[PDB]
Design a protein around this motif. Structure first.
Motif, short mmCIF file in Angstrom:
data_model
loop_
_atom_site.label_atom_id
_atom_site.label_comp_id
_atom_site.label_asym_id
_atom_site.label_seq_id
_atom_site.Cartn_x
_atom_site.Cartn_y
_atom_site.Cartn_z
N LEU A 120 4.49 -33.83 8.87
CA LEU A 120 4.80 -35.21 8.24
C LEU A 120 3.35 -35.88 7.82
N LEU A 121 2.35 -35.43 8.11
CA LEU A 121 1.13 -36.26 7.60
C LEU A 121 0.11 -35.09 7.67
N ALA A 122 -0.62 -35.41 6.47
CA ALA A 122 -2.06 -34.50 6.39
C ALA A 122 -3.28 -35.48 6.23
N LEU A 123 -4.16 -34.90 6.96
CA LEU A 123 -5.49 -35.49 7.03
C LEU A 123 -6.14 -35.74 5.84
N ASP A 124 -6.05 -34.93 4.90
CA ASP A 124 -6.55 -35.35 3.43
C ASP A 124 -5.75 -36.15 2.50
N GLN A 125 -4.54 -36.81 2.89
CA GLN A 125 -3.66 -37.54 2.06
C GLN A 125 -3.89 -38.85 2.04
N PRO A 126 -3.85 -39.52 0.95
CA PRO A 126 -4.23 -41.01 1.02
C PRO A 126 -3.19 -41.79 1.78
N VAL A 127 -3.83 -42.73 2.49
CA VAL A 127 -2.92 -43.57 3.42
C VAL A 127 -1.99 -44.31 2.57
N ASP A 128 -1.85 -44.62 1.42
CA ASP A 128 -1.17 -45.46 0.53
C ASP A 128 -0.07 -44.37 0.06
N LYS A 129 -0.16 -43.00 0.14
CA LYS A 129 0.93 -42.31 -0.37
C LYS A 129 2.14 -42.34 0.89
N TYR A 130 1.77 -42.76 2.12
CA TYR A 130 2.77 -43.01 3.07
C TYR A 130 3.25 -44.60 3.20
N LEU A 131 2.32 -45.55 3.05
CA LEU A 131 2.42 -46.96 3.08
C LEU A 131 2.23 -47.26 1.79
N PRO A 132 3.12 -47.52 0.82
CA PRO A 132 3.01 -48.05 -0.44
C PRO A 132 2.34 -49.58 -0.78
N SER A 133 2.75 -50.12 0.49
CA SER A 133 2.28 -51.37 0.75
C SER A 133 0.66 -51.78 0.25
N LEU A 134 0.03 -50.35 0.79
CA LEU A 134 -1.21 -50.60 0.71
C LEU A 134 -2.01 -50.03 -0.61
N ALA A 135 -1.17 -50.10 -1.59
CA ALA A 135 -1.56 -49.54 -3.07
C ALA A 135 -2.23 -51.01 -3.57
N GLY A 136 -3.22 -50.69 -4.38
CA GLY A 136 -4.13 -51.74 -4.77
C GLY A 136 -4.92 -52.38 -3.88
N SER A 137 -4.79 -52.09 -2.64
CA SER A 137 -5.63 -52.88 -1.51
C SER A 137 -6.79 -52.03 -1.45
N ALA A 138 -7.68 -52.35 -0.52
CA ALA A 138 -9.00 -51.66 -0.06
C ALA A 138 -8.50 -50.45 0.39
N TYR A 139 -7.49 -50.29 0.95
CA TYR A 139 -7.38 -49.18 1.74
C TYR A 139 -6.39 -48.10 0.74
#
Length: 385
Positions: A120-139
């Motif tokens: 369900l998670l990968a260490l190399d994946q972007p944190v916004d591929k799982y929380l789309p709320s953080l797209a276009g944020s610093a994260y």
């Protein structure tokens, strides 16, 4: 007598008369979800019993004087999975649940690991591929692994005593109990360093771990904790986890409460590389990369806080220095969880030791009392060899 429990907004500021009662009654001041135990309970048999002593101010002093000096509420030392030492203080006993503060960081880091074991998670994946709320944020583009490593490089003012700091804003969101408040504060913060290169302690970034675990498992994190560890291994008593809102989302960075022996049982889970009854809850070598020490990394002991702190960082664990840099008795590659006011969950795979320490210091950071805790724990290691 009448319990001395303070207002929700005074957690980081209670006078000493109130700290014990508040810390073992957090569900009476905050929304919480229950972490359910199960039918099986893994044993913690008695073992080699120790009466550790050690020196302070040129004088020798044992467990009682340590408890008195450092206002200690609990100590559990496990060696080889058996109980070598077990004390309760400040009113507590075997049934008390005590809040973890930032100790839960490491727990939720571990839960990320179990999610990684499940896909369900990968260490190399972007944190916004799982929380789309953080797209276009610093994260955006930041990885799960960089968030585990407190290395996102987002600007985070952690000062508590600055009322307009990011830590204090996060505390405000908590006290408001509005769903998604913390996540919104996170998405409005500016970038400061290249992701992967600089370490900033950010309890908001830690909370991202809870948010991701929910996005991935689509169940409450308390239930995930229960299903992977708490009801599998067999914790002896239910826990509970402080929430951001009524029936809302677990704080990934603070607010877990369990009994002392349950804390020890989690530590024992970790010592045994995440294996329960033969199935692997944690990935192969998860514990190894969770507490890597590597001289070249910006996380290695000695390099954090501009060299004014002796411990390095792993996957939301603190790492002890090794080699000639090691503290006395803390050399095997020992690593700990910790949280303010004196909370420690120390793990030493070399010696096969787990130690849990509950404390109620007057301030949240005291160098005298941390080094004295390391002294006590080294006396225990030395007494158990």
């Amino acid at each position: 007598e009448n319990p001395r429990i303070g207002r929700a907004a005074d957690l980081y500021e209670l006078i000493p008369e109130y700290q014990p009662d508040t810390y073992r009654n957090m569900d009476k001041v905050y929304p919480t979800r229950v972490i359910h135990k199960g039918t099986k309970v893994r044993p913690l048999p008695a073992g080699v019993a120790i009466a550790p002593r050690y020196r302070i101010g040129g004088e020798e002093y044992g467990v009682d004087d340590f408890m008195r000096r450092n206002r200690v509420g609990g100590v559990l030392v496990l060696k080889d999975g058996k109980v070598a030492l077990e004390r309760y203080g400040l009113g507590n006993d075997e049934r008390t649940r005590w809040t973890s503060f930032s100790v839960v960081k490491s727990i939720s880091s571990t839960l990320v690991g179990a999610a990684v074991q499940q896909g369900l998670l990968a260490l190399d994946q972007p944190v916004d591929k799982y929380l789309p709320s953080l797209a276009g944020s610093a994260y955006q583009g930041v990885t799960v692994e960089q968030v585990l490593q407190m290395s996102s490089g987002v600007r985070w003012n952690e000062t508590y005593r600055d009322p307009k700091s990011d830590r204090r804003q996060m505390f405000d969101a908590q006290l408001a109990e509005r769903p998604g408040g913390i996540l919104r504060l996170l998405a409005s913060l500016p970038r400061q360093y290249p992701s992967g290169t600089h370490f900033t302690y950010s309890t908001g970034e830690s909370h991202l771990q809870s948010e991701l675990l929910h996005a991935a498992t689509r169940i409450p994190v308390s239930d995930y904790l229960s299903e992977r560890i708490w009801a599998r291994m067999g914790m002896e008593s239910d826990g509970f986890w402080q929430l951001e809102s009524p029936a809302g989302q677990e704080i990934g960075s603070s607010g877990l409460s369990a009994t002392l022996r349950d804390y020890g049982r989690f530590g024992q889970f970790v010592l045994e590389d995440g294996v329960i009854d033969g199935e692997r809850i944690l990935p192969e070598g998860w514990v190894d990369r969770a507490s890597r020490v590597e001289a070249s990394s910006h996380l290695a002991p000695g390099k954090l806080y501009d060299g004014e702190y002796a411990l390095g960082y792993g996957y939301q664990w603190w790492t002890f220095p090794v080699g000639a840099k090691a503290l006395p008795e803390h050399d095997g590659g020992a690593f700990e969880a910790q949280g303010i006011f004196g909370q420690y969950l120390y793990i030493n795979r070399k010696e096969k030791i787990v130690a849990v320490v509950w404390s109620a210091w007057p301030k949240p950071e005291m160098d005298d009392r941390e080094e004295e805790t390391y002294a006590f724990l080294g006396a225990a290691v030395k007494a158990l060899r």
